[PDB]
Amino acid sequence: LNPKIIIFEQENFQGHSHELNGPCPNLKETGVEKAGSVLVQAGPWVGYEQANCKGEQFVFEKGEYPRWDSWTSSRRTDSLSSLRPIKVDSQEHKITLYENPNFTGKKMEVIDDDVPSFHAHGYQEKVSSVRVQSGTWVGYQYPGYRGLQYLLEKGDYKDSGDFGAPQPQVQSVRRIRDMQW
Amino acid sequence: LNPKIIIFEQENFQGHSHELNGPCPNLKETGVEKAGSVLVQAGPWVGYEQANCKGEQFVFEKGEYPRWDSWTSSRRTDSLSSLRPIKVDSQEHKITLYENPNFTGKKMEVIDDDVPSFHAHGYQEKVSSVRVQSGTWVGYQYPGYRGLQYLLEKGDYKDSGDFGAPQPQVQSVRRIRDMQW
Amino acid sequence: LNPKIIIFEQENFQGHSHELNGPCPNLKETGVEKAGSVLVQAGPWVGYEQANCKGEQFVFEKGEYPRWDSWTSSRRTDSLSSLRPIKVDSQEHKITLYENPNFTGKKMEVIDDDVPSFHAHGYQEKVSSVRVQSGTWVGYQYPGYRGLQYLLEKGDYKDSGDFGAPQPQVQSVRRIRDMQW
Amino acid sequence: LNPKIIIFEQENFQGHSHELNGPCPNLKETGVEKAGSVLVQAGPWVGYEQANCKGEQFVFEKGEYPRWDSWTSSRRTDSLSSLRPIKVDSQEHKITLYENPNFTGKKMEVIDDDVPSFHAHGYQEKVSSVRVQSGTWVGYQYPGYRGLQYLLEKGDYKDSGDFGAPQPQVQSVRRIRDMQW
């Protein structure tokens, strides 16, 4: 829901502690004199050498940082004065296939890759509706990309007829990754 | 520039031929009585069993289709009456690093992956400007993700100072793929 | 444990059925006159047009094949006379990190990719022993490939001292994928 | 041919320099008193804090290291006394398809991934022989995994007949990545 990082006045997560859920242009404001240890529970975050998000940068990933050298590659400075969460830009291609019409029953989500066999994913229900959130996909009736093919583009298919299936049957899907125009 | 597919009245790319650069809701219009062979030079395209982009679907990828069974998995019908190019939705994470300021000199493009060493890619120039088109990246001064770190988010950095580098030096980059908020 | 495929005399998995757990150079031997439908539960398998694993080839992946055209792209022939499982050659790079010495306690397996943060995988125990089954890896004390580095090559490390850690602490790992010699 | 790394007595690649093409259990032997800068041209290499490949570890990737802090994350010690190249264990799945029999003419190498269209790779010759070095692959006559299928396992196919092709025609290939036994 929120990013979450905890700063400690002392190493080893010792001393006065302070939780942040958003940017802090001036950490002195949290009462902790000079961060000594940091604990990141929901990130990532970028911390700065100076206030206002200026000077040397340090990116913090989920995990434990028990001392300043754990985060300053340069080992330039031990100063940590500003923090902010990072909104990561990370684009996947995703399609969700559902057992029943209208996006109900068992579901199967596929992120970016091709799947030559749904039963090998434990999916063995029929496919009555599909939601394509991104990417260009091709669904096939049988495993190994065989039988009738259905082009699946961004959009909602509430029923199998909408994608052209004569029966709510899909057993493989592949993503179209290239265009030569 | 345009998609390009050529339909032949006969198998083996024989007979009256017709080039399409866009959708054809009714192939009879091209003079070719019943497509016998198809050649795709810039795709992909989706063809349909009936006019107006109705009935069984067939997706065509760059390559040669010398006969109807080469494209109809069902082998249901041999009918090909409508065609249209497919606009593929395919999202990459890309960053371009340039030798000189302002996006000039030698360049290096990185698509989605991490690169622990620029010299192993043949890139050994300094890095003075960066263009991030998508993704969240972290640039480092030395190979193996060492030294000063620079967070690189969508945007243009005309000079190294804009990304916080004290010198136009970058030798590794990694992409931030997850957020826990 | 064994591959498993079931052949039916009739379409739709109807009629006399027969389970195979190994190669059948002559399917007539199973009593089913001409396979009509096939069900693959543990594969893949390769089937042949003629006996003895001769003629047209058809590869079967986990899933349901309710009729012959579901498996013969050519749609050449409807004949299925020999079957054999395929031993797939599929090489991964794998490392397992364990909470306690000697390969005990909680464990974390990593297949081929880099992991910048163990806590983001739900792993937050210390790392006392490592098993590297394949690949060249580099373990680091903190997230984001920071702190002491430990080169991890094929082999068993029963205790953290064997990999050179001063403490059973590892929070990131990356695989070395290239050599320039 | 050999790994190659050059050690300099001074920072910025200054001073007495020494090239290594193999392990050096005691760098004092090269005349350079305390490495100040390192240049890696063919690696990777692992360096050690003490002689004989003991103490803190530092992995060196192709690139420039102008000062000691460029390589010691700990920033523990500035000592570099032993070096050795790393033999990387890195397993790919590779298949090479050739225009003419016997592994001659134009060639196309495929490493690990599926290729739905050879013409989209610029390959438009026929395929008369195949070398599979690793992996389990399936070759198809037309693009998009259509037409006759040929199972391609580790081994040499000097002519198209050996893989069962009736014509030296292959336009797509996919790798079989899973086995359920």
Closest residue to B89, CB basis, from A43, A57, A134: A134
CA distance B1 to chain C (A): 33
Contact check, Cβ <8 Å, C86/D179: yes
What the block records as the tokens of B177 is 């793929």
Give the number of residues written for chain B.
Answer: 181
Beta sheet of A4-10, edge-to-edge order: A14-20, A4-10, A37-42, A63-65
Provide, as residue numbers in chain D, all residues whose Cβ is less than 8 Å from the Cβ of A145: 144-145
For residue B113, count other CB atoms closer than 10 A to its CB: 10
Closest residue to D71, CB basis, from B116, B146, B172: B146
DSSP state of B153: -
The CATH 2.60.20.10 portion of chain A extends over 3-88, 89-180
Provide, as residue numbers in chain C, all residues whose Cβ is less than 8 Å from the Cβ of A143: 40, 60-65
DSSP state of C101: T
Task: Write out the DSSP string of A25-71.
Answer: S-GGGGT-SS--EEEEEE--EEEEEETTTEEEEEEE-SEEE-SGGGT
What the block records as the tokens of A15 is 């001393």
Q: Which CATH superfamily is domain D89-180 in?
A: Crystallins (2.60.20.10)
Contact check, Cβ <8 Å, D65/B142: yes
- Identify which of B19, B69, B26, B18 has the alpha carbon closest to the alpha carbon of residue B50: B26
Element of type H or E holding C137? strand C137-142
Contact check, Cβ <8 Å, A70/C172: no
Contact check, Cβ <8 Å, B120/C180: yes
Closest residue to C144, CB basis, from A59, A142, A143: A59
Resolution (A): 2.1
Contact check, Cβ <8 Å, C117/A71: no
The residues near C160 (Cβ < 8 Å, ≥ 6 apart) are C101, C127, C128, C129, C167, C168, C169
Give the angle D143-D144-D147 at the CA atoms, nearest 5°: 70
DSSP state of A119: G
Provide, as residue numbers in chain C, all residues whose Cβ is less than 8 Å from the Cβ of D42: 180-181
Beta bridge partners of D64: D39
For residue C109, count other CB atoms closer than 10 A to its CB: 10
Task: Write out the DSSP string of C15-32.
Answer: EEEEEESS-BS-GGGGT-
Provide, as residue numbers in chain B, all residues whose Cβ is less than 8 Å from the Cβ of D64: 119, 142-143, 171
Element of type H or E holding D148? strand D146-152
* Strand B37-42 with B14-20, pairing: unpaired
A69 → chain D, closest CA residue = D74
Pairs across A and D, CB distance < 8 A: 18
Provide, as residue numbers in chain A, all residues whose Cβ is less than 8 Å from the Cβ of B65: none
Closest residue to A136, CB basis, from B3, B86, B179: B86
What the block records as the tokens of B68 is 């109807």
The residues near B29 (Cβ < 8 Å, ≥ 6 apart) are none
Cα Rg of chain D, angstroms: 24
The residues near A122 (Cβ < 8 Å, ≥ 6 apart) are none
Cα–Cα distance for residue pair B60/B37, rounded to 1 Å: 12
Structure-solving method = X-ray
* Strand A129-132 with D94-100, pairing: unpaired
What the block records as the tokens of C22 is 């190994």
Provide, as residue numbers in chain A, all residues whose Cβ is less than 8 Å from the Cβ of D116: 174
Strands (DSSP E) along chain A, which ranges? 4-10, 14-20, 37-42, 45-50, 54-60, 63-65, 82-85, 94-100, 104-111, 129-132, 137-142, 146-152, 155-157, 172-175
- The CATH code of the domain at C3-88 is 2.60.20.10
Beta sheet of B137-142, edge-to-edge order: A82-85, A45-50, A54-60, B146-152, B137-142, B172-175
Pairs across C and D, CB distance < 8 A: 137
Contact check, Cβ <8 Å, C134/D2: no
C155 → chain D, closest CA residue = D89
Tally of CA atoms within 13 A in the half-sphere of C47 that contains its CB: 27
Which chains would you list as touching B if contact means 3+ CB atom pairs under 8 Å? Answer: A, C, D
Provide, as residue numbers in chain C, all residues whose Cβ is less than 8 Å from the Cβ of A71: 142, 146
CA distance D149 to chain B (A): 12
Cα–Cα distance for residue pair C27/C34, rounded to 1 Å: 8
What the block records as the tokens of C37 is 């439908």
Cα–Cα distance for residue pair B76/C71, rounded to 1 Å: 14
Phi then psi for residue D30, to 5 deg, are -90, 5
Give the angle D145-D147-D150 at the CA atoms, nearest 5°: 75
What CA–CA distances, in Å, run from C169 to A9, A82, C28, C122, D2?
22, 28, 61, 15, 34
Phi then psi for residue B70, to 5 deg, are -75, -15
Asked if A51 and A76 touch (Cβ cutoff 8 Å), the reply is no
Provide, as residue numbers in chain D, all residues whose Cβ is less than 8 Å from the Cβ of B62: 117, 119-120, 143
Strands (DSSP E) along chain B, which ranges? 4-10, 14-20, 37-42, 45-50, 54-60, 63-65, 82-85, 94-100, 104-111, 129-132, 137-142, 146-152, 155-157, 172-175
| Greatest Cα pair distance in chain D | 68
Q: 3-class DSSP state for residue B121?
A: helix
Cα–Cα distance for residue pair B40/B29, rounded to 1 Å: 19
